[PDB]
Amino acid sequence: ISRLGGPNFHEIPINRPTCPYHNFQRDGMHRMGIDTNPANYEPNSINDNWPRETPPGPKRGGFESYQERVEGNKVRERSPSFG
Amino acid sequence: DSLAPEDGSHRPAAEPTPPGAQPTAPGSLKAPDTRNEKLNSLEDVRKGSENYALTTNQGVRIADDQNSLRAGSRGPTLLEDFILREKITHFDHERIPERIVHARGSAAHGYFQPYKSLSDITKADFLSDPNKITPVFVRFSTVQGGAGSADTVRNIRGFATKFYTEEGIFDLVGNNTPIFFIQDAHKFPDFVHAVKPEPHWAIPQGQSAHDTFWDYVSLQPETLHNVMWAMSDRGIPRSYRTMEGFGIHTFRLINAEGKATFVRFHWKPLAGKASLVWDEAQKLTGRDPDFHRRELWEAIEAGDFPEYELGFQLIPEEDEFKFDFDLLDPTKLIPEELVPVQRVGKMVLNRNPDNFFAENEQAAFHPGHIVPGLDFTNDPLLQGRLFSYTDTQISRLGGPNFHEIPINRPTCPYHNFQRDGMHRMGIDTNPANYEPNSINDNWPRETPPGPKRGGFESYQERVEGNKVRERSPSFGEYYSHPRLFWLSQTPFEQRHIVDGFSFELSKVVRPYIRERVVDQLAHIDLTLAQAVAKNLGIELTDDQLNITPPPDVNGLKKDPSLSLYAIPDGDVKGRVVAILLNDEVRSADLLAILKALKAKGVHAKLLYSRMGEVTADDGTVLPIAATFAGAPSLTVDAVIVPCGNIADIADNGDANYYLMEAYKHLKPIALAGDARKFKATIKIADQGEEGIVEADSADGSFMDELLTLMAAHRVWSRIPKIDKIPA
Amino acid sequence: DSLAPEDGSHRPAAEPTPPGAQPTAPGSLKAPDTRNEKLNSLEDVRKGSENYALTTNQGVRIADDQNSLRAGSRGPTLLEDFILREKITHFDHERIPERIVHARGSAAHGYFQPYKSLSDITKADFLSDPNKITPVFVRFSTVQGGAGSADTVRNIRGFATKFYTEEGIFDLVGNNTPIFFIQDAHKFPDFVHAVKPEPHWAIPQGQSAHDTFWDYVSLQPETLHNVMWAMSDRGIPRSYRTMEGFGIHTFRLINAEGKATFVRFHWKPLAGKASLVWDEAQKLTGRDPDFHRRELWEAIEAGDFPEYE
Amino acid sequence: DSLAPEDGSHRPAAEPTPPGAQPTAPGSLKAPDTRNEKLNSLEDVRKGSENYALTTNQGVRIADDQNSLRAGSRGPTLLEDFILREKITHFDHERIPERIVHARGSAAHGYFQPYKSLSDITKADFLSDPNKITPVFVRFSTVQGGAGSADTVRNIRGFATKFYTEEGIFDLVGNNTPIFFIQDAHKFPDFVHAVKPEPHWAIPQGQSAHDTFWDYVSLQPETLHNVMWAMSDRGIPRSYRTMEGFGIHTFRLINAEGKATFVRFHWKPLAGKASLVWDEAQKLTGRDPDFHRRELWEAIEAGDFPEYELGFQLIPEEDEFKFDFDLLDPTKLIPEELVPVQRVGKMVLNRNPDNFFAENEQAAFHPGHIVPGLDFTNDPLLQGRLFSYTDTQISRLGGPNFHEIPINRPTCPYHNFQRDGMHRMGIDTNPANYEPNSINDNWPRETPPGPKRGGFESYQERVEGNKVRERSPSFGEYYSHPRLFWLSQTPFEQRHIVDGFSFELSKVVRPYIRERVVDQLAHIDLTLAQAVAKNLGIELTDDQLNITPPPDVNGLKKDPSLSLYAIPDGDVKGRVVAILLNDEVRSADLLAILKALKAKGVHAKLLYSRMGEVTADDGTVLPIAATFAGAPSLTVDAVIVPCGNIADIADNGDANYYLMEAYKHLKPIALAGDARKFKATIKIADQGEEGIVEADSADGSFMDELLTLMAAHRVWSRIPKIDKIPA
């Protein structure tokens, strides 16, 4: 954000995905993309909710975190196993 | 040089004066002996003016600040004019990004003190002793509009307090309603994009009355509770002095024993609760878009300091699951009938800033700024807030040293190993910039948590679950709190809610959105749903008519603590009366009027059809503050018309309009003697009407009646009668 | 999803429609057949939306755009939630500084064409051929208020035209009166500080009706000419369509022979000149602070294109 | 924790100490008693450390600065960890853009004082009284490379002086040669782009030895003058204390009567002029890229304060056109034989900064910062500079309030009507932010110009001509000044210039560029051009051999002030000697060596094959400063090898290479007793050689002889002899 001058660093040519990117983020310094989506929020009806969430699955699916089990108290502590 | 007048009209008195009596001024010049530890510590950066030479920023004296350097007096401007370029450069760079939300806000300095030591429930140092005075800087705001938008919009309001404590800055960043629109911070950009001006054309400014906002609400029923509040008169406060504050989230208090108590924060306005009515607020956005900013500043200048009582709703850790809502759900309020607010301390705002930009615009409040004795909870809205406020400040205030901007500085010591960053002020002398180090004997050093002056340690809450992006099922109830709020409102408050929904939804262009909203209302209350439907030309279906009302909240149907007005707490000190003058006023009326107002600390403004002065029957020279059209009734709490040559004004279209408007807006009107000729313009019958004061003259009883009306704020009984006046 | 209505009435008609008949829309969705060279060259940065998956800016498809990642469904949000942090980060950084002056403004695309070749008096390419069409972008504005202030204030108005010519960008940066308040640029910060909200309390917005402005004026009689314009109904135009524009300064035209001619620039509203009255303008700042922005947008959507000579 | 050693040895003595004796430290800790007005004014932002608790930036004490907050000690890190996030946020945002040029530089605090009042020629307050002391801050720099590049590159050096005067900041922003490369500021991006790393791959750092530089030079002969200076040993100074300084441009002095005198600024090093040799400089960029930065700091810690004398070349307005060259042409120097330098005052640099980033990196110097008594001229390079420094500072330092960053602040009053901008520190209380105003009686006010404390008014120079983009024909001569410089150099200086051109052009990949430069050299001097050609395998054509040499400069063939060495000025104080130890050193030799060096303020470093201690013949325990490989001969000015058990080190290749390197780089070497066994490594004849000091012992004249050589800096007569040695 400071080094590249703002939140549109992904629009700097070397950083750009070659695959599709579409979402409801807008504005920021040096904004290159001109969004035509009538909607900048979801859920929306005015654009039939596009672009849409995608369920996870075997290929071309949405990102879902592995549901790791977390069990512990809130601590600032180094694990004994690291010592 | 010799430009000020020799009489000295140019410079306001360094002493409390009523609104409009003197030109307003920087706080340090207006009240140079109002002091607190923060205000004193800002003295190193305060810059004066008088008797100094005009210079560049480099300290070079300027000879001619009227002209560029050119080759010949009609020639081209020269690149070597460093005086011009410095001056234009600084101008060209004055602006910084406004806040993403709450850009529009007004701020003041003050102090807080507790009523008693709270050490049984929290080790927070600022709450440990009633003699501990904590300086505060408080900023009130709207939500949606830009920094240049209007004050009396319909909006939630922001109420942010920076406590400069001896153990760290604590920012309590709250709003004027006890819940928020959404449950999880991940949705904040969606909600805020929906409410903000629409992205193709950037309209409308400062209004939720447009398609995208109601589209989102209609699709996200969690929003309905706060939408209810916004549509009520809560959304249009009379002044920042007369609204409540809430932290919204459940936080924790942590005592020296390490016991955690759940807490929700409250601010109670000691002036009492009071709101405008919609038409008055909307008109006020056009006549004075600075109305609330002005009202705050002038209240402080007059000595009418905004005062608030800090209150805590306290819930034992073992009571976490004892309600039929989730304590961690920020769309749910805790009804005061179930958990009372313990009155904990008082905050007084008693000094305006010196420079709006330096102190208000650059101030940085963040709810993550807590101190030992306080802690967070898992509220998923609060959790995400913790990331945002730090992050946004990096661009808005130009880098990671924003805490060195004077207004933001702690008054207490700060020492750590952090270095550099844009505009670094502090020059560090520590041999070491890392720890652990031997080369400076490890200083500055960590401090173990403790009862007092201890280091921060988080409360060791048990976390048990899988890594999931999932809304807790406990949060999945959307209607019962909107209902509790609705049932708690007076009939005139309910009608104003109906009117707010009806007015907003009428501006929504896609009819299907209006219908989907009315459907949601039908899940809350049928009377509300029908009243709004009727104003929209919508007919509820068979099905909609038969939607079962949501259940009570722990057996509560209503809670009068949620109404603005149900329980009297009205107060007149600092309110304002317009007095309509004529060319020969009955001096005796004026003396009695002014004496009674002064007694109660109510201010007056003397209005006529031109500036200057009129003379009272007995040669008393009366100065006019403004014209009828120049200071409309919108800006006052009541209107009194005294006796005299009423023919001078009884045909004045503006004089009549003034009264018609005040009448429409349910304001107390008092008519003395020949002032009663005006009764015709507002169609009042001879036997009177409750809320209109009329006597032969402006006697002591006449003023008493008027001040009683003013303490009840507005004349709610008049509502069925305002239909039939064209104003 | 099932989210749009079945009858398709969420969507404005892609054809000229009168004010209030349809919801307003982005220009290229509203009027997809309108084109000029500049609008065509913007096509490489236009971003659509229909039928695309919701992604991060790195192109990663998002599954749940309703929730933060937490340890347990009532637990703490985790620092590893990079979808949440990217989204909030971009939100957190949306704003840029507003313009120092003329922050409040409304703009549209269009085109310019000269009536005849002016090669006898200027070598400027955009004026060399009645067939030469030059795209433009024009922003109209007030002066004093912030980007979030009201349209129908009493103010001078800005009228700025960016001409995308074949020999460079020419910006004609004008106002709606033929003169300015001050004579020398050195005093600009003085005059603008005087008119802007006063530094102690930041009041009033969008209004010259306060002490410091009139202080400055009283002490600097050169300001009186533009002040007369501002106090007239010129200060409250009915719409940007019915005001004049002026470059104010004398500039030069230079022809191929090297001959200079002094020139002052003018815009004539082909819709004619028209203003509000003060009470109507002030009330409108309250009822519709976006009245001029809306008027401009809706005229264009209706096909009442603003025209200027 | 309690982490320092019990002896208190982690802490350097707050007293002057030789280089390497104690750990270096922040200036205010090292020299707490060294004060001036500016240093005192910075106290307000100096931050200590000792005995303070470690906090956040908000002043909250941290308990555990070793760990993030996680759910379980092996669990995920939690977003609520505000302490982690503030800490990483600050770190993440530490960097700011480096300076576009002169990014690499080293700086110190000091003071200036004039020898006598210059009131007759200038009303500049800082030059008005010999008892008036002006705080300064000075930064010396290279030109091309980034802030992390090496010190001892071949480059022009920057010499920038911020004078904190009572009537404003005056920045004198000069270089170490009296001309610049180009004539008009419009070409600065072209020249700088040509010399900087090439844009496809960003190579090479810190070097002009690449194609684009020499391409530009070959096409722009105006550059040749400064290029001659860069290729001479001027381009590789021994240290910032031993180079000259120049303002380059003609400026004006203006006295109280309004008379303008043309002036060029000079700094004379009181330590004398001295440079490295190229092979030594290049190797030093590898072995110690911070050599000049280190040398500056340690000189100051030692008490060898860098001192410079300010001098003016003064030319009457009537003599503007009396030279073969144009006074306004920054590619031309003014020969001291034609216009002497008049001594003006003395500047002493006597305190290091506390924090390099805060004071050095954020310092902002700009040659437009002048004061009444000074003015500009139409020099077209200067004229463009006035635009650039202001502009670039707005991004580098993050907005228009850079003058509020502590190092940049005037010590004198600064007041004006400028407001806001990012990072605004000053809180203005003036009711007025514009002039003319009546509301503050027009304060701060303009001040007319006058003899003292007056407003700035530009000298009313006549301007006459058309608006043109045109180089003055008076500027169109490129070769006579290069030739003047060339002819003033000693034979060994000339050889070094040939070698510099030869080495640089050999790195140019395109042979035609080498040819083009050689052709330019043939316009300057045939001997120069032939010698460079020979080194490049190029043959001059008959046409090139016949190019007539450029005319003399106003009848001057040479001017010895242009040589580094032609007129000795050899100061030995602050220089340093390597002493190569063995495991049984003659303690008598060492007493004699160390005491003689100390008496002259010459430093020593005791070197060995390992660290720790060695014990001398008589039991004296000798602490080892560094190893032979660790502190190579590059870093010292001479080498002494005392007597003892030489067999201990005669076999040590490092010890031999130490002498061979020192020998090759023309440094004095002294060998006592059996140390003379090392004569064979460096092929010294039995009878001896000028530049090698040898005796049975270090007694008698041994140390005087060595010190005499050190005063002459290097052993130039040794040059024919080094060609052979393999080092």
Ligand code: HEM
């Ligand atoms: C309980 C709900 C919330 C309340 C009571 C609240 C309150 C406020 C207030 C009063 C301000 C203005 C502070 C000032 O006067 O300077 C503000 C600003 C802000 N809010 Fe919140 N807010 C809420 C939700 C959120 C959420 C969920 C986010 C993001 C995830 C967020 C992000 C921001 C940001 C970025 C600003 C601007 C901060 C600055 O520029 O300094 N808010 N909020």
Ligand code: HEM
């Ligand atoms: C003939 C008198 C002037 C006219 C007609 C004029 C007109 C305008 C207009 C129409 C704009 C807004 C352009 C837009 O829509 O973005 C503007 C902006 C601006 N003007 Fe001028 N102006 C005048 C005088 C000045 C002077 C004397 C200065 C400074 C010395 C100045 C500095 C600025 C700046 C800093 C902006 C904001 C530019 C930006 O952020 O892009 N103006 N002016």
Ligand code: HEM
């Ligand atoms: C007589 C010829 C010149 C001399 C003696 C000179 C000297 C210097 C010095 C010593 C510095 C570094 C100051 C410091 O230590 O921070 C510097 C920086 C700089 N120079 Fe110049 N320079 C010359 C020509 C120019 C020209 C023609 C330009 C552009 C028009 C220019 C633009 C800059 C800029 C942008 C910086 C960085 C300033 C900053 O970031 O604060 N220089 N120069």
